[PDB]
Each structure stands twice: as C-alpha cells, then as structure tokens.
Symmetry: D2
Subunit: 115 residues, 4 copies
C-alpha cells in the first residue's frame, strides 16, 4: 500500500493498538468522500489501506480517532482526533507513512515519504 499509518502511545510507551483510522479524498465539490479505513494492529500499524492504482494525485485527509483511544484507557484527551490533510504528488517518493505520536494534550503527525 502506498499509504500506511503508524501510531505510538507516549503515555504507555507502546504501539497504539486498535485505533480507528479513516482516510478521505476531496471531491470536485470540495467535500470529503470516504476513501479507505481500518484499525491499527498489535504493532500500531495499519497496512493494506489502498493500492498504487487507486491512490492517485489529490488531496487526502487522514483522521486518527484519538479521542476514542484515550477514553478506552481512562484518560480525558484534548482533541476529537488527529487530522492530517495532505496532497499526494506523483513526482515525489512513492510510499507515504503517516507517523503519529500521541499524548492526551500534545501530539505530532509526520509524513515519512520514501520508496
């Protein structure tokens, strides 16, 4: 899959397991159509989201549903979800990994773009 999502839990120092992830692609009407989704594995990773054929250039939104994750651990978080909006570009490297580091009130989202 040209798009992968990896999530780490900075409170427990663990992969963030069973975190729902939703990917949307922006349509011609400037609305977000569902594109792909899943839940992170025991390794905190979500594979198989899409294929090279389906992941064409465009604007994508990745929603990592962090609020539900922290609620299940018993910690009240700040945000509804971590949101990454980005443009997929064919000229750059072929694989996009969205790496999220989560704490309840602070979090980072980084794109590692490789091939």
């Amino acid at each position: 899959s040209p798009l992968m999502v990896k999530v780490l839990d900075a409170v427990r120092g663990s992969p963030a397991i069973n975190v729902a992830v939703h990917v949307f692609r922006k349509a011609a009407d400037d609305t977000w159509e569902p594109f792909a989704s899943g839940k992170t594995s025991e390794s905190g990773e979500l594979h198989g989201l899409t294929t090279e054929e389906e992941f064409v250039e465009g604007i994508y939104k990745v929603e990592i549903d962090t609020k539900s994750y922290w609620k299940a651990l018993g910690i009240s978080p700040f945000s509804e979800h971590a949101e990454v909006v980005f443009t997929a570009n064919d000229s750059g490297p072929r694989r996009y990994t969205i790496a999220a580091l989560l704490s309840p009130y602070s979090y980072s989202t980084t794109a590692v773009v490789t091939n």
Copy 2:
C-alpha cells in the same frame, strides 16, 4: 480571549509570524460554521480571537494555514493545513492555548487548558 493560538517554526527556532488561522464551530446541522479568524503576530501568538461570551460550548476546528507559511519560506511541505478539532467548555468555561510547531513534513499540536 479564552482561545489563544501560538505558532512556532521548528526549522528556524522562531515564532511563526503572519500565519493565517481560521476557527470553525460545528453547527446544529453538522456543517462547520465560520467562528473567528486572524493572523499570528510577531511573537507567533494570535490574540483577540474571541470572547468569553461568544465562545460557548461546542465542537471547534482550528485550521492553521501552514502549507502557505512554509511555501512562503521556499519549502514544499507535506500537509496542507494543521487542523485541531476539540470540544470546548463541556465541563464549563476554560481558557485554551493551542501551540502549533511547524516543520515541513511534520506538525505538533499542544493544548494548555486552564481556568
């Protein structure tokens, strides 16, 4: 203002000046309604966004136009906008400071919530 946004540049170690920030509030019909907007000052902070009277309970979206900030520095970044979605004032009125740290391929969001 009960809502304050601070934007910093992690490449140069400086405040991020003149960055556009748009705040939306989810309406009854689930659409994002415009709420407030402004641009960060020389300190990287955006003050005067709203007031205690206007900033009622709700789901807010803070959109930091950030790709634009980096492109102004000659950097083609990964993400279009930093986006922070949070429920505000659900336990009663609070003061929210959202600090966004900008890197070309990465964004960090931190919220300090006080009384």
Copy 3:
C-alpha cells in the same frame, strides 16, 4: 534572563509546576560545571536563571528533573531526565527559550532563539 525554560504536561494539558531544572556549562577541562538552577513556577516557566553578563559563550546542558515530576504524579516514566545540550551565544548574545513537553514515555524539546 537570556535563558528561560518552560515545562508543560502533555498528559493533563497544564504547565508543569515545581519541576527542578539544573543548568551546567562545559569547563575548559571538559567537565560539566554547575551554572544555574531553579524550579518552574505555576505557569511552568523558570525565570531569573541567569543574566546577560553571566551567560557567556559556551556549551550548556539543561537538565530537567522530570522522572521526579512524573513519579510525583504516580507515573513511572521511561527517562530519568530531559537533557538539552546546546552551544549558546556563538554568533553573539541571544535570548533562548527552551520549552519541554513531558509525557511518561516521551519528551519534546523546542528552542525559540531571539535577539
């Protein structure tokens, strides 16, 4: 003070109060010599560490006693101390603000350097 340290709690979204901070300066013989120390205030900031006259060029080590902060909250964290090692005033005198964000298994260090 040309050197300011701010400590924030990423689990609770609050300043980190009463955190011990020790600053060292590398001596001619390569040992770390004590330079200044203090404890963060209710805002999470430690002011009054040093002066323009005392903070000369050199290699400085900022040690944030942080494992101790987390252990006081009932959290057994990964790291003993947040540690920031930097050369200061090598291009001339500057003002340094170091912001440390504390999580149990993670620490983030940000420096804002101004004139």
Copy 4:
C-alpha cells in the same frame, strides 16, 4: 537486540540516514562508560546494538548526534545532540526502541517498550 534506535527527519520527511548513535552505561563512579554504538541505516534504524545477555538493568544514555546530521544537510541546528537517559528494568517488556523525531529547533524522543 533488546535496544534499537529509530530516527526520522521532519524537514525532509525521510528516515534520518547515517546518524551516529552512542550508548553509554553509568558506572559505579557515576561516570558514563561506552556501551555500544553505530550509525543509522537507509531505513533510519540502528540494529544489532546489544544482546539480551549484555543489556542488564542499569542507567543508560543514548546520544543521537543530531548536530552533525543537520550540518551535513546545510541547516544550523539548536542542539549538540538529542540525549535520552533512561533506566532499563527487567520487569517491563523486553525490547526498547528509542524513536526520535528531529527538526533543527524541535525534537522528540520516545521509548516504545514492547515484546
């Protein structure tokens, strides 16, 4: 290896390649003795640092030499190196991965502890 180091470059959105990493263990005299070292691979990862037999409980320091990395990319950084001081504990999970996210003026170090 029970200890692994992974490093990401938030300016380029890439693994941080060829980054020198030094691990020290604290001795009875409170001095840091060299323990293991290496340089990150094309994946930004450093494998084979140690073995379960050699990595006993104690206090360890991981120095990721970030200054040299940013100098080779043409960006003046804040810090001499990212430093992680931590205590290895036999009761917890067996594998420690130190995950570093680097920008020139802001960086995070997280321990992912698994088995």
